[PDB]
Design a protein around this nucleic acid. Structure first.
Ligand code: ZN
Lengths: 317, 53, 120
RNA sequence: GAGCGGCGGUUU
RNA sequence: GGGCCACGGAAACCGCGCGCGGUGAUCAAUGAGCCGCGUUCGCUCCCGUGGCCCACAA
């Protein structure tokens, strides 16, 4: 039940006296509904039937959006967590694609096998597996219930792992063979099965409750701030005085850091946040946490994708 | 569809009563949705009432 | 019980609903399944709508009560979709049924409509 | 134009 | 020169699947079979055009 994204990170304070000016920027709960959508992400509960692409096409038409993109494609018959990043948040899916996933799956064996052997043999699949040629991690497998040839289980896996193929290989290890009869994604990175997970019916109904009834509350809760899509990443938080620079394509230099997560290695994907926990940009660390911590000059993060508009913070340089 | 889940437990099960919670379980997949949504008007009517809108 | 169940129907009355459907089927005209039930209410052909109380997800039939009141057509609940199916003359469940022509159940259907009127 | 995370095909 | 941002780097038909409409079935009415109509998102590199900045955080 533990994936790498579930690691607790420690915050390291670089500048004790950094403060943020409440007049600058728009932290998620100061975003007017329209702005909230522009930088929004939907934790969608995909229904079985349509493809993932089709589902996003429907969302764009119904919600009158110009742009949107989903994370890990779910197959037509599969239900569950499908992050849908909207408008200006669209490019944040690139932070989700590589994140771990969890599924509940129903396997149907093609011959009779004792419950104990089924369980014992499935447990062997935790750890590395090779599937049709590439290697992929299985972080955990938990058998929930067995009814004859029907095996209900949960599995946490590395991005790109095919549960179908896993199930097929389990069938071969047992000899009788097996196929996947039902699949549901219950987690993708920071997106999980909680109150934010919303069906298409609720999504569109809440939308109309907003546009047509004048009730903003339900639709506002249907949309997550883009910051949510970055919850699993290591962060460096920056001072107000560096924020407009970064939004203008400046790399983040050490003197601009207020605090940062421990454990950052060179080359890591990091999220650059303001002290109000707004997403500014995605980048790649050019230093370790300890380097960023002890040094007083040099480029700490190579800024690659900028999400915050250039006019949220003044050009203090 | 056979996968069910406890609305209380969060437990996934094939049973109609949660082996943990004891609560009645519900089908785990969301209802199928149409871009045409022929009865949307009426579902909204029922849903506003449920939510006290 | 489910939110689309807008009122309490006594065991007696529910049993009558199944009877009406059963009688209307071989002596009159009914439609079975929610798509045909809905079309019947929309085309103004349904004299009575019968809705199962164990439908999951609720969205399968939750539009019916508002749609019926719109078209001013009486609707009533029975406890079991499986049992409503059997009465409708099929071996599978039926989440909802519409009686189009009552037949030998004219009186039964007239009675039911009166008690629900009270429950509303 | 080169690739990753449902598209399989015939055409300039 | 460099970074960041936007737009462009094909189009039209067919098939599965799925959706809708119609019909409504000898255990798929939470929709079979058949007919007709619809229907597939983005991201990353690199390159072209255009825009904003060159900001070690004061
Ligand atoms: Zn419980």
């Amino acid at each position: 039940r533990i994936l790498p994204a579930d690691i607790k990170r420690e915050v390291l304070i670089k500048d004790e006296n950094a403060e943020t000016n409440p007049d600058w920027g728009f932290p998620p709960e100061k975003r007017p509904i329209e702005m909230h959508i522009q930088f929004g992400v939907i934790n969608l509960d995909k229904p079985p039937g349509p493809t993932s692409h089709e589902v996003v096409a429907w969302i764009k038409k119904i919600l009158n959006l110009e742009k949107a993109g989903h994370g890990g494609t779910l197959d037509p018959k599969v239900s569950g967590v499908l992050p849908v990043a909207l408008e200006k948040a669209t490019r944040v899916v690139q932070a989700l694609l590589p994140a771990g996933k969890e599924y509940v799956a129903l396997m149907h064996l093609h011959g009779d096998v004792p419950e104990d052997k089924i369980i014992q043999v499935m447990k062997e699949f935790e750890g590395e597996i090779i599937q049709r040629l590439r290697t992929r991690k299985v972080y955990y497998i938990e058998v929930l219930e067995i009814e004859g040839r029907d095996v209900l289980f949960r599995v946490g896996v590395e991005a790109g792992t095919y549960i179908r193929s896993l199930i097929h290989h389990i069938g071969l290890a047992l000899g009788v063979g097996a196929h996947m009869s039902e699949l549901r994604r219950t987690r993708s990175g920071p997106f999980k099965e909680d109150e934010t997970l919303i069906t298409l019916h609720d999504l569109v109904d809440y939308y109309y409750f907003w546009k047509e009834d004048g009730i903003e509350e339900y639709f506002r809760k249907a949309i997550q701030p883009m910051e949510k899509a970055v919850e699993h990443l290591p962060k460096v938080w920056i001072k107000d005085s560096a924020v407009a620079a970064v939004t203008h394509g400046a790399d983040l230099a050490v003197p601009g850091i207020a605090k940062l997560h421990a454990g950052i290695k060179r080359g890591d994907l990091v999220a650059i946040m303001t002290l109000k926990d707004e997403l500014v940009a995605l980048g790649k660390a050019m230093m370790t946490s300890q380097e960023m911590l002890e040094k007083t000059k040099g480029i700490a993060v190579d800024v690659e994708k900028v999400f915050m508009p250039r006019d949220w913070y003044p050009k203090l340089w | 569809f056979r996968i069910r889940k406890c609305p209380k437990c969060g437990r996934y099960t094939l049973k109609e009563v949660c082996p943990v919670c004891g609560e009645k379980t519900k089908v785990a997949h969301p209802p199928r949705f149409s871009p045409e949504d022929p009865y949307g008007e009426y579902r909204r009517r029922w849903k506003r009432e449920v939510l006290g809108i | 019980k489910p939110s689309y169940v807008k009122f309490e129907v006594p065991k007696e009355l529910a049993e009558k609903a199944l009877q009406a459907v059963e009688i209307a089927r071989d002596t009159g005209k009914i439609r079975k399944g929610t798509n045909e039930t809905t079309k019947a209410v929309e085309r103004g052909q349904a004299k009575l709508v019968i809705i199962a109380e164990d439908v999951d997800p609720e969205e399968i039939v939750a539009h019916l009560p508002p749609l019926c009141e719109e078209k001013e057509i009486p609707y009533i609940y029975v406890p079991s979709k499986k049992e409503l199916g059997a009465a409708a003359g099929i071996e599978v469940a039926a989440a909802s049924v519409a009686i189009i022509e009552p037949g030998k159940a004219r009186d039964l259907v007239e009675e039911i409509a009166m008690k629900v009127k009270e429950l509303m």
